[PDB]
Amino acid sequence: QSKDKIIAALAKRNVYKSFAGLYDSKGNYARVGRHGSFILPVSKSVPTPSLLIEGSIVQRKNIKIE
């Protein structure tokens, strides 16, 4: 019971036993690639994921606020 109160208090401090990348997402085939290859241009057509992190662009919401 006393562990639940510590954790709850650390959460007010934005402290958790878990963070991104620590535990397996399920609870794989990606590979590194070839060094010294060519680095090619591509189109920045639509807002990339990075800009939702920055805040320059936001996801729509089904919400009206007055």
Interface residue list for other proteins (CB under 8 A): 3, 6-7, 9-10, 12-25, 28-66
Closest among 62, 38, 57 to 47, alpha carbons compared: 57
Residue 58 CA to residue 41 CA, distance in Å, equals 26
Q: 52 and 62 in contact (C-beta within 8 Å)?
A: no
SS3 state of residue 54: helix
40 binds, among other proteins, Cl ion, none (CB under 5 to 8 A by kind): other proteins
52 binds, among other proteins, Cl ion, none (CB under 5 to 8 A by kind): other proteins
- Applying CB under 5 A, what is the total number of residues that bind Cl ion? 2
Tell me how far, at minimum, the Cβ of 12 lies from other proteins, in Å.
5
Q: Write out the residues near Cl ion by the rule CB under 5 A.
A: 23-24
